[PDB]
Amino acid sequence: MKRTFQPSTLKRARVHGFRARMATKNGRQVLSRRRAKGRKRLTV
Amino acid sequence: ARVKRGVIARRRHKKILKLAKGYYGARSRVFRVAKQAVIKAGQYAYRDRRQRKRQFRALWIARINAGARQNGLSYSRLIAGLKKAAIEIDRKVLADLAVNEKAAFTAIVEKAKASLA
Amino acid sequence: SGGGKKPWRQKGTGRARAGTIRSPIWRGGGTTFAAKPRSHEQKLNKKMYRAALRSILAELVRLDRLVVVADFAVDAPKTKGLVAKLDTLGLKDVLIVTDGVDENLYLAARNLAHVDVRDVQGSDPVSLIAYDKVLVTVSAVKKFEELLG
RNA sequence: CCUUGUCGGGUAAGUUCCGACCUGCACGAAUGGCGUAACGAUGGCGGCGCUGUCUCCACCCGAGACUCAGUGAAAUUGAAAUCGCUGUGAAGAUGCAGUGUAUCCGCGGCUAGACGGAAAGACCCCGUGAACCUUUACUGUAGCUUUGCACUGGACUUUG
RNA sequence: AUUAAAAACACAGCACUCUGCAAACACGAAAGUGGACGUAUAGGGUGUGACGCCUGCCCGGUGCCGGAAGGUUAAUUGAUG
RNA sequence: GAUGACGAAGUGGUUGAUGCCAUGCUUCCAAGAAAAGCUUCUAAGCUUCAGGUAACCAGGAACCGUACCCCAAACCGACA
RNA sequence: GGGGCUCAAACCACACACCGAAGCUGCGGGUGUCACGUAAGUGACGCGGUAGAGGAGCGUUCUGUAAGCCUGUGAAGGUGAGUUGAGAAGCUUGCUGGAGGUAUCAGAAGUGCGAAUGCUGACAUGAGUAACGACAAUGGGUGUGAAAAACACCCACGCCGAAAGACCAAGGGUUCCUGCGCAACGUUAAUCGACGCAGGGUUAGUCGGUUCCUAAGGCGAGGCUGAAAAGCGUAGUCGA
RNA sequence: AACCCACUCCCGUUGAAAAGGUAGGGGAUGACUUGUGGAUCGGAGUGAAAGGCUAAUCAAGCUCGGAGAUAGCUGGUUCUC
RNA sequence: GUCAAGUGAAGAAGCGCAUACGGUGGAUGCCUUGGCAGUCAGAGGCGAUGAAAGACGUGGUAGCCUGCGAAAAGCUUCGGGGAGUCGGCAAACAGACUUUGAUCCGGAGAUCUCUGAAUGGGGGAACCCACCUAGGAUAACCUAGGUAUCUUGUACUGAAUCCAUAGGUGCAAGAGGCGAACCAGGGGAACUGAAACAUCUAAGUACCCUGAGGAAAAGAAAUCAACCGAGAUUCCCUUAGUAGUGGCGAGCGAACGGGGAUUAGCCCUUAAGCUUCAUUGAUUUUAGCGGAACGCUCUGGAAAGUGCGGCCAUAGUGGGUGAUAGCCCCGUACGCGAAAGGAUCUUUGAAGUGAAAUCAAGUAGGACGGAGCACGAGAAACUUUGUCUGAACAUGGGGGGACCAUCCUCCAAGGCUAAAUACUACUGACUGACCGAUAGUGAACCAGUACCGUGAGGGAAAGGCGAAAAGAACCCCGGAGAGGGGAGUGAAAUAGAACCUGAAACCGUAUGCGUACAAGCAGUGGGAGCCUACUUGUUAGGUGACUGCGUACCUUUUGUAUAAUGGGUCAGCGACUUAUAUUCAGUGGCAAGCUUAACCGUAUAGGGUAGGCGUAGCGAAAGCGAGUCUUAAUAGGGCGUU
């Protein structure tokens, strides 16, 4: 009975990290929406 | 112009819950049960203003009946004298004279044994 | 702000039907008939303003609330000089209606607590039914009859 | 389907089973036909052994239950001073009517009722609701294909 | 996955059909890629489902394959009225 | 109940791996990573000092992680 | 309907009484309409009510009247009592409150809640009920302590022992250790703790990474392609 | 045996657990089990095929917009005479 | 006394009701350092001179905010200010700095680590590894610069290939990124409405994408008009919901002509205009300075309030001071003021640009297929064009809604142009019949936080002591507890920090009465006894033995006690609004007239009568008019009419 979150700091950064978001246009506007909302982290 | 309704709603709950004073349980202390209970108590209070006039009319008649059969006459023979004689005296004070002034009630039932009709 | 998705599924949850966190029933939600900036300006006919002024001036005469002077001018721009001249008329809480408001008469009496200095054009239904006396000059009743008669 | 067809076997007795018969409602030869060793947490039958499955439960051992100490929930809930019966009644009553019972209050148990609790019935109907699938429904359309004209030329001939 | 582990699916074997290679086919507005750095004993698709004995009749309907060349038929052309 | 000083025997025969020889051998088809370090060859180049190869001598090897938990009360499961 | 009833408390007639409705009458109460009244004023007929139409109001907050009036000799608010009105509701007052309030008459509305399996918070009931997380197992002594079934040590007894033992990667992030603590957290108590507060603690040429190299795959100068965004990709250069 | 599975019983169903446990059971040198990194995604993948699976969600994920969709339906709509 | 019988007051484990206090809880009222919406202005961008957004560091205590950046709550300079200061949560304490002028406030400069377009190369953002040149350093480094790509320009170099093209290399110059809307374009839904749906609608909306600017686009007639004329564009008001258009359904919707806002047209024989500098005066902005006039008295903790008397006023309904202040304080009216920058306007030069070359050819026109014009290809004009074609040349050519003639009016295929207009993330000032902690921003408070998700994303709750901390020395019980009892403090501590008010549900203690042989919506009519206050009793409050009648409420229904729905309860919140058109009623102003819209306005005034409706109808219409139609028929009816 394993669950859906199996943590890995390497897979977290290559899917959701900052370079990954700013590599593509649709994620480069995740980072601007998430900065327009004024969030503390903007890459989690 | 915003208006908050906490001062008017608590004085309106406190009127209906003062009229509920003396009621068992949540009928006297929560509003949804006390509003219904004060409405019901004023439906009954309306109804029983009519029955009070009926319950005393039965009690007068029952004591006049009981005090007439002391003198050898029923209720309906005592009342029957007075489409022929005329005392014009009512059930309220004949019941009060059957109990209290028992000799002045014997004088009325002999005027009704004088009518014979 | 917010309340896009439904808070729970439509059935099965034993909970009353919701469609947003921001319903007007919910304490986060919007006012149901929320205000927007609107105007409360309304239309008087031009004949109807004039007939209502002409009905007010008639009652200012009839109640002795209208006091006509030959001319009304102060020389210095000074409130003390105009208090001292209204006191010669037995007069406080006044409307002063001139034909044209001069500059010293405006600089005096614009601190003074219960007077106004209007011209005839700038007189209005409320401010000559509000002050306990109205001073018009003789030049003002000429201008009131150019407008109303 | 009729149907537990009929006959044989197995049982004391067998709608299942086995072997037959052919009267195949409504088998049939690559939506394969009929067999078939081995295989199977496969379906149905029968036997041996074994037994608390059962006649029919008895005793025993641990963990709860029960009691005391400490901590401390939940679904539910209009309000409750919350009986039986027989009638009545939006047609199956703790509450109406009539009448019998019945001192007041727990605890342990048992679940007949409270049309008990749980999920705005899943069946059924409804809606000029939805979705998804189908096609020889309607209307389209991607794709494939045909020809005209472009890109696109000359040079003889069959040919008009 | 979380009520169905089976007789369902897969399978080896079998057949049918497509495909001559810049292959059929598939993903792509397209370049490109996969098939495949393979080449008909190969690859795709369909159906049956070890093996043994076998797989009858029907080409009307519908599909597919081939066929004359007649009739009907589209844009285009623009005679004549 | 801590620490400073002293402190004895320490050999032999058996049985042995799932460890090592072994990335070895034998056999089978389904036919079994790349690239660098490394070894070597020359090119373009060199003054044929630089460069190379041994020897001797002297010095150096930066940065980051390191506690603790892992058949879990420290991870994934709202929970010791 | 029950008790119970038999020259009836039954049925059939007739006579006379009586009881019985919010009906009717007596008596006291608004204006609903209408007619009269030079508008005091009495009369007459009404007055159950859902959907619904009409008519009249009360109360709340705000603005004008309001630089007014009230109020620290005590506002709003809260809690009582008394009183008045057909009603919504008003007025007066005791206590609490400790700084505001708004006669009247107009103006504006976030204007009146018990229901929407409403929404938020608080709080009941169930109920001091069920449970307290594997049925390895605990029993004494001593200590400390405000208090020990649970902490420390001691003597026993059980349990695991291809782990309930030792490690590594991952993942976490100080949980490690010591002194002081026990509110909260710990399914009880706790002096104990993975809890609080403060100090300390992690030392590398050789162990792991970086650095070197590549796989899948990603990016990709130019380039090819595509309404745009972009897709694909060569050289390359990332990626254990 | 480990390991991976999940046929049967019972318990558990407010659970120790949003799918477990105990006793038995299947595979266990293979079409095996598994770590780490990667590839494919919403009329779209993936599927030894069950409409299965695509983060406890799947006859079309999640999230935010169109958007206060629409609802001839449901429920509710607050002072007095 | 005894025995029989009859009668029954006390004795409540617990419950009910009332009252009195108390707890829980946080309502209400009052409040505000926070929001919300306007009006008037500002300036409309930031960034390779390294932005938005950050990571990490920076302090005597040191966490998090705010500042800063290894020069790190700051360093140098001017200018201002004049007595205190070392930012805030956060009060204290250390060690200090300041009249030889600190802190603070503006202008200018210096520093400015790491990430981020991120730009030397990589990468899992805040990390890793380098190279080149110059200088300095003892087998280790250090300092100051360079090192991205693409575009354009330029120099040098040179493949197949002879020439020179491609390519290579170096230099200059520029670009990239971010931002709430506004703008020009590219691509473009669907639910929905039509009471189904497909044409159509929704709607060229949402959304994605690309550019530009402080505005943008548009714009100087191949434009409209009817034989009269008007002259760019954009914007508002009307024409008018009219003409048209449309499964002629739902719907969509002009123009002519008027009224306004604004006011410029220049050129392709080279121009206005605009950018960059350099200057000429001027005006603003970035901080400040001066800034009038009240005492006594009363109550009180405290006076601004009371009572009396004054004063000031270009300053009187400001903020807060121990209760309500024109004269206490800070302001306000009103005057003044700038070392140094910024910005606007203006002189008068300069380099540019506009600028495409020379009045427009693959263009106008046409045929197919689309799209637009309000116009669903329709008699369809006009405009755009994906495919195919294809002119005339001022004794031309286009338009005037199929088309043809005649008139009228214009010159397409080159351009550039201000103002009126749109918007507000950001500043500032004023304002509100806006909100007042369940409200108003999600956010008054360390909020886009905590928390939930792998992620995009979702997204809270939480204000109030007092005037002043005067925040409770000391004593006592307790575990050097928690929490209390005193004493102090204050006006008040039942203002003691969870702190103003302190409601209701809910939970208690005390007291009075009722209740253990009596059946059910829990009340109501009658009613004894008992108990409290009072005064007379024929009262007032509490309790209510006993008894008559009595099956909650909502919703939904022909009907519900219904065993039909909904509600555990309390407190807050929660549902007929607003805009624009229109009709009817009431109430008003004017009246055969009435009323204005944009806009103007020293601005609720006044102007502005474009328009709208009325005074005349009938007809499909020309038209005729107190009258048409019809038919050869003024012959016969419908509509209107003082």
What are the extents of the domains in chain B?
Answer: 1-117
- Please tell me whether residue A8 adopts helix, strand or coil conformation: coil
The 8-class DSSP code of residue B82 comes to G
Amino acid at C38: R
Nearest residue by alpha-carbon distance to C1' of I455: A16
Domains of chain A, CATH where assigned: 1-44 (1.10.287.3980)
Q: Give, to the nearest 10 degrees, the angle between helix B31-68 and helix B91-99.
A: 70
Phi, psi dihedral angles at C136 (to 5 degrees): -110, 145
Is C57 in contact with C66 (CB distance < 8 Å)?
yes
- Nearest to B36, CA basis, from B46, B22, B47, B26: B26
- Provide the CA B37 to C1' E59 distance, Å, integer: 92
Alpha helices in chain A (DSSP H): 9-16, 18-21, 25-28, 30-36
- Which value in Å is the resolution of this experimental model? 2.9
Method used for this model? cryo-EM
Protein-covered nucleotides on strand H (Cβ within 7 A): 17, 19-20, 36-38, 55-56, 63-65, 68-69, 71, 79
Task: Please state whether strand I lies within 7 Å of residue A28 at its CB atom.
Answer: yes
User: What DSSP string describes C86-130?
Assistant: HTTTT--SEEEEESS--HHHHHTTSSSTT-EEEETTT--TTHHHH
Q: How far is C-alpha B41 from the geometric centre of its chain's CA atoms?
A: 16
